[PDB]
């Protein structure tokens, strides 16, 4: 599942 | 060019509008990157993560309580209402409009929008830590112990609330600690929402981007899915584009002024 802001 | 957009707007049977922080920012909502610089002295790392909520749930709830209460004086701006009215006007023609929003303030729902997708959740929903139930909650104050708390002045006494008096789960056999149904840094998006949005964004034949850009998250996840099918994409944000290399449709300026003429 997708990290918000892709992590950083 | 405006009338080139308007030509597509007239044809379009399925519009998808992706919204970012710019739209919420024009209603005066603090968004911790633009307006409302920081809260007390704190940063995302001791505020908007699961770790920070485990270490200090009083402080996080203090923070999220502030953001719930500021909404009582922040109202939908013209962009919010132009979208919502457009949805209703087109919907009655048999033409869909859906909103995919990163915003957690519920301003689209207050504006009158109906078909909304909140990909980061909402300030006014609670998820229970025990049983996982999601409930809408606009109660002010959310719980007694937070009344008058969450003040934004960097030298405010911490509420330091006993965890059993923070917002608890009303389903009586549970009594679990609640949290804002919000997507924190280091958590994932909901798989069911992403599927639904994939479906909508494959359906759509005109995609709007308001309050953000297609290069940056979250528009960058899907705007390749739509542009690759030759679907026109229109940005309504405050950033400029290059000296020569234009966007296909890009309307510089505040969303409150740009958008309502576009959607009439
Ligand atoms: Zn529960």
Short mmCIF file of C-alpha atoms and ligand atoms in Angstrom, two decimals:
data_model
loop_
_atom_site.label_atom_id
_atom_site.label_comp_id
_atom_site.label_asym_id
_atom_site.label_seq_id
_atom_site.Cartn_x
_atom_site.Cartn_y
_atom_site.Cartn_z
CA UNK A 1 0.00 0.00 0.00
CA UNK A 2 1.06 3.51 -0.88
CA UNK A 3 3.00 5.70 1.57
CA UNK A 4 1.61 9.25 1.69
CA UNK A 5 4.08 11.73 0.17
CA UNK A 6 5.71 8.40 -1.00
CA UNK A 7 7.70 8.30 2.32
CA UNK A 8 9.34 11.75 1.99
CA UNK B 1 -6.53 29.34 -23.33
CA UNK B 2 -9.99 29.55 -21.65
CA UNK B 3 -12.39 28.76 -24.51
CA UNK B 4 -10.27 25.72 -25.46
CA UNK B 5 -10.96 24.33 -21.94
CA UNK B 6 -14.63 25.36 -22.21
CA UNK B 7 -14.97 23.29 -25.39
CA UNK B 8 -13.86 20.17 -23.51
CA UNK B 9 -15.99 21.12 -20.50
CA UNK B 10 -19.11 21.08 -22.73
CA UNK B 11 -18.33 17.67 -24.30
CA UNK B 12 -17.19 15.96 -21.10
CA UNK B 13 -19.42 13.19 -19.67
CA UNK B 14 -17.19 12.17 -16.73
CA UNK B 15 -15.10 14.83 -14.95
CA UNK B 16 -12.61 13.96 -12.19
CA UNK B 17 -11.35 16.79 -10.03
CA UNK B 18 -8.33 16.21 -7.83
CA UNK B 19 -7.90 18.81 -5.07
CA UNK B 20 -4.91 19.80 -2.91
CA UNK B 21 -4.01 22.18 -0.08
CA UNK B 22 -4.28 25.39 -2.18
CA UNK B 23 -8.09 25.22 -2.16
CA UNK B 24 -8.22 24.69 1.62
CA UNK B 25 -5.60 27.45 2.03
CA UNK B 26 -7.85 30.04 0.32
CA UNK B 27 -10.47 29.40 3.06
CA UNK B 28 -7.86 30.26 5.74
CA UNK B 29 -7.36 26.64 6.89
CA UNK B 30 -3.88 26.12 8.37
CA UNK B 31 -1.96 23.61 6.24
CA UNK B 32 1.46 22.94 7.69
CA UNK B 33 3.65 23.85 4.68
CA UNK B 34 1.92 27.14 3.62
CA UNK B 35 -0.49 29.11 5.95
CA UNK B 36 -0.30 28.64 9.72
CA UNK B 37 3.52 28.21 9.66
CA UNK B 38 3.76 25.76 12.58
CA UNK B 39 1.72 24.78 15.70
CA UNK B 40 3.19 25.59 19.08
CA UNK B 41 6.83 24.80 18.19
CA UNK B 42 6.20 21.27 16.98
CA UNK B 43 6.88 19.48 13.72
CA UNK B 44 5.18 16.65 11.84
CA UNK B 45 7.55 14.15 13.55
CA UNK B 46 6.13 14.60 17.13
CA UNK B 47 2.58 15.33 15.79
CA UNK B 48 1.42 13.46 12.66
CA UNK B 49 2.90 9.90 13.01
CA UNK B 50 1.75 6.64 14.72
CA UNK B 51 4.92 6.74 16.85
CA UNK B 52 4.10 10.26 18.12
CA UNK B 53 0.51 9.16 18.89
CA UNK B 54 1.83 6.18 20.88
CA UNK B 55 4.33 8.32 22.81
CA UNK B 56 1.99 11.24 23.52
CA UNK B 57 -1.68 10.85 22.51
CA UNK B 58 -2.65 13.92 24.59
CA UNK B 59 -0.41 16.22 22.53
CA UNK B 60 -1.58 14.78 19.18
CA UNK B 61 -5.23 15.07 20.22
CA UNK B 62 -4.51 18.59 21.49
CA UNK B 63 -3.21 19.31 17.99
CA UNK B 64 -6.05 17.66 16.09
CA UNK B 65 -8.61 19.33 18.44
CA UNK B 66 -7.23 22.73 17.45
CA UNK B 67 -7.70 21.90 13.77
CA UNK B 68 -11.30 20.71 14.27
CA UNK B 69 -12.23 23.88 16.15
CA UNK B 70 -10.63 26.37 13.72
CA UNK B 71 -13.03 24.96 11.06
CA UNK B 72 -16.05 26.52 12.85
CA UNK B 73 -14.88 29.96 11.53
CA UNK B 74 -13.37 28.81 8.17
CA UNK B 75 -15.93 28.58 5.37
CA UNK B 76 -16.05 27.07 1.87
CA UNK B 77 -14.50 29.43 -0.72
CA UNK B 78 -15.85 29.97 -4.28
CA UNK B 79 -13.81 27.05 -5.71
CA UNK B 80 -15.46 24.64 -3.27
CA UNK B 81 -18.94 25.89 -4.26
CA UNK B 82 -18.30 26.13 -8.01
CA UNK B 83 -17.21 22.49 -8.00
CA UNK B 84 -20.21 21.44 -5.90
CA UNK B 85 -22.74 23.37 -7.94
CA UNK B 86 -21.13 22.03 -11.17
CA UNK B 87 -21.43 18.46 -9.91
CA UNK B 88 -25.16 18.94 -9.27
CA UNK B 89 -25.85 20.78 -12.55
CA UNK B 90 -23.97 18.14 -14.60
CA UNK B 91 -25.26 15.18 -12.56
CA UNK B 92 -28.83 16.06 -13.51
CA UNK B 93 -27.73 16.02 -17.15
CA UNK B 94 -26.39 12.46 -16.61
CA UNK B 95 -22.78 13.66 -16.36
CA UNK B 96 -20.58 12.62 -13.47
CA UNK B 97 -18.17 14.75 -11.46
CA UNK B 98 -16.08 13.18 -8.68
CA UNK B 99 -13.67 14.78 -6.25
CA UNK B 100 -10.48 13.06 -5.15
CA UNK B 101 -9.09 15.21 -2.36
CA UNK B 102 -6.01 15.13 -0.16
CA UNK B 103 -7.80 17.60 2.17
CA UNK B 104 -9.13 16.43 5.56
CA UNK B 105 -11.21 19.52 6.45
CA UNK B 106 -14.51 18.33 4.86
CA UNK B 107 -14.87 21.69 2.99
CA UNK B 108 -16.05 19.93 -0.16
CA UNK B 109 -18.87 18.23 1.83
CA UNK B 110 -19.91 21.55 3.42
CA UNK B 111 -19.91 23.16 -0.07
CA UNK B 112 -22.52 20.68 -1.28
CA UNK B 113 -20.28 18.16 -3.09
CA UNK B 114 -21.62 14.58 -2.81
CA UNK B 115 -19.35 12.21 -4.78
CA UNK B 116 -16.11 12.82 -2.84
CA UNK B 117 -13.11 10.62 -2.15
CA UNK B 118 -11.11 11.60 0.95
CA UNK B 119 -7.77 9.81 0.34
CA UNK B 120 -6.21 11.08 3.60
CA UNK B 121 -9.41 10.68 5.66
CA UNK B 122 -11.12 13.44 7.72
CA UNK B 123 -10.57 15.58 10.86
CA UNK B 124 -14.22 14.83 11.67
CA UNK B 125 -13.99 11.06 11.69
CA UNK B 126 -12.58 8.91 14.49
CA UNK B 127 -11.04 5.47 14.12
CA UNK B 128 -11.02 3.31 17.26
CA UNK B 129 -7.69 1.69 18.15
CA UNK B 130 -9.32 -1.49 19.58
CA UNK B 131 -12.23 -2.47 17.31
CA UNK B 132 -11.50 -0.26 14.24
CA UNK B 133 -14.96 1.35 13.84
CA UNK B 134 -15.13 4.58 11.90
CA UNK B 135 -17.64 7.20 13.08
CA UNK B 136 -18.36 10.76 11.95
CA UNK B 137 -17.81 13.14 14.86
CA UNK B 138 -18.39 16.92 14.77
CA UNK B 139 -18.98 17.20 18.55
CA UNK B 140 -17.33 20.37 19.90
CA UNK B 141 -15.43 19.79 22.08
CA UNK B 142 -14.81 16.16 20.95
CA UNK B 143 -14.39 15.17 24.63
CA UNK B 144 -14.79 17.21 27.90
CA UNK B 145 -11.08 17.04 28.86
CA UNK B 146 -10.07 18.87 25.65
CA UNK B 147 -12.36 21.90 26.22
CA UNK B 148 -10.30 25.08 25.74
CA UNK B 149 -7.22 22.93 25.10
CA UNK B 150 -4.99 22.71 22.02
CA UNK B 151 -4.06 26.39 22.16
CA UNK B 152 -1.53 27.29 19.41
CA UNK B 153 0.78 29.59 21.50
CA UNK B 154 4.25 27.85 21.73
CA UNK B 155 4.33 28.45 25.52
CA UNK B 156 1.03 26.88 26.47
CA UNK B 157 0.76 24.43 29.34
CA UNK B 158 0.30 20.95 27.91
CA UNK B 159 -3.12 19.49 28.66
CA UNK B 160 -1.31 16.26 29.66
CA UNK B 161 -4.65 14.44 29.67
CA UNK B 162 -4.96 10.98 31.27
CA UNK B 163 -5.43 8.58 28.35
CA UNK B 164 -8.70 7.13 29.77
CA UNK B 165 -10.21 10.67 29.49
CA UNK B 166 -9.13 11.27 25.86
CA UNK B 167 -11.85 10.47 23.28
CA UNK B 168 -13.03 6.89 23.85
CA UNK B 169 -15.16 4.50 21.82
CA UNK B 170 -18.89 4.91 22.62
CA UNK B 171 -19.64 1.18 21.95
CA UNK B 172 -19.72 0.22 25.60
CA UNK B 173 -17.96 -3.19 25.70
CA UNK B 174 -14.95 -1.60 23.91
CA UNK B 175 -13.90 1.75 25.45
CA UNK B 176 -10.92 1.92 23.06
CA UNK B 177 -8.81 5.05 22.57
CA UNK B 178 -9.88 6.87 19.41
CA UNK B 179 -7.68 8.68 16.91
CA UNK B 180 -8.38 11.02 14.02
CA UNK B 181 -9.30 8.92 10.94
CA UNK B 182 -6.44 10.64 9.14
CA UNK B 183 -3.53 9.27 7.13
CA UNK B 184 -0.35 10.03 9.08
CA UNK B 185 3.25 10.14 7.79
CA UNK B 186 4.48 6.56 7.50
CA UNK B 187 0.99 5.01 7.10
CA UNK B 188 -0.54 3.76 3.84
CA UNK B 189 -3.53 4.78 1.81
CA UNK B 190 -6.65 2.61 1.93
CA UNK B 191 -6.63 -0.08 -0.80
CA UNK B 192 -10.42 0.07 -1.39
CA UNK B 193 -10.28 3.86 -1.97
CA UNK B 194 -7.33 3.61 -4.40
CA UNK B 195 -9.21 0.96 -6.44
CA UNK B 196 -12.37 3.13 -6.61
CA UNK B 197 -10.25 6.13 -7.67
CA UNK B 198 -8.45 4.05 -10.30
CA UNK B 199 -11.89 3.09 -11.67
CA UNK B 200 -13.12 6.72 -11.65
CA UNK B 201 -9.90 8.04 -13.24
CA UNK B 202 -10.09 5.40 -16.00
CA UNK B 203 -13.77 6.40 -16.63
CA UNK B 204 -13.04 10.12 -16.81
CA UNK B 205 -12.71 12.24 -19.99
CA UNK B 206 -11.55 15.53 -18.44
CA UNK B 207 -9.41 15.75 -15.32
CA UNK B 208 -8.98 18.88 -13.23
CA UNK B 209 -6.20 19.54 -10.74
CA UNK B 210 -6.90 22.29 -8.21
CA UNK B 211 -4.64 23.43 -5.35
CA UNK B 212 -1.65 21.25 -6.33
CA UNK B 213 0.31 20.13 -9.46
CA UNK B 214 0.45 16.88 -11.43
CA UNK B 215 4.22 16.54 -10.81
CA UNK B 216 3.71 16.30 -7.03
CA UNK B 217 1.81 13.82 -4.83
CA UNK B 218 -0.98 12.81 -4.90
CA UNK B 219 -1.90 13.85 -8.48
CA UNK B 220 1.25 12.14 -9.82
CA UNK B 221 -0.09 8.67 -8.95
CA UNK B 222 -2.94 8.85 -11.49
CA UNK B 223 -2.49 11.79 -13.90
CA UNK B 224 -0.26 9.39 -15.95
CA UNK B 225 -3.21 6.92 -16.05
CA UNK B 226 -5.45 9.68 -17.53
CA UNK B 227 -2.99 11.55 -19.81
CA UNK B 228 -1.81 8.28 -21.43
CA UNK B 229 -5.40 7.84 -22.76
CA UNK B 230 -5.22 11.31 -24.38
CA UNK B 231 -7.52 12.82 -21.72
CA UNK B 232 -7.06 16.56 -21.23
CA UNK B 233 -5.72 17.66 -17.85
CA UNK B 234 -6.29 21.18 -16.48
CA UNK B 235 -4.36 22.66 -13.51
CA UNK B 236 -5.82 25.53 -11.38
CA UNK B 237 -2.95 26.35 -9.03
CA UNK B 238 -0.72 29.26 -7.98
CA UNK B 239 2.64 28.07 -9.36
CA UNK B 240 3.73 29.41 -12.78
CA UNK B 241 5.01 27.30 -15.70
CA UNK B 242 8.25 27.83 -17.77
CA UNK B 243 9.11 30.77 -20.07
CA UNK B 244 8.40 28.70 -23.25
CA UNK B 245 7.26 25.16 -22.30
CA UNK B 246 3.56 25.64 -21.42
CA UNK B 247 1.11 23.14 -19.91
CA UNK B 248 -1.78 21.87 -22.14
CA UNK B 249 -4.24 23.74 -19.83
CA UNK B 250 -2.97 25.69 -16.79
CA UNK B 251 -4.70 28.63 -15.14
CA UNK B 252 -2.39 30.55 -12.85
CA UNK B 253 -3.88 32.47 -9.90
CA UNK B 254 -6.18 31.80 -6.90
CA UNK B 255 -8.69 28.92 -7.30
CA UNK B 256 -11.44 31.20 -5.93
CA UNK B 257 -11.15 33.41 -9.04
CA UNK B 258 -9.96 31.00 -11.74
CA UNK B 259 -12.34 28.05 -11.27
CA UNK B 260 -15.91 29.53 -11.00
CA UNK B 261 -15.70 31.22 -14.45
CA UNK B 262 -14.33 27.94 -15.88
CA UNK B 263 -17.23 25.74 -14.64
CA UNK B 264 -20.29 28.02 -15.29
ZN1 LIG C 1 -13.95 0.44 19.77
#
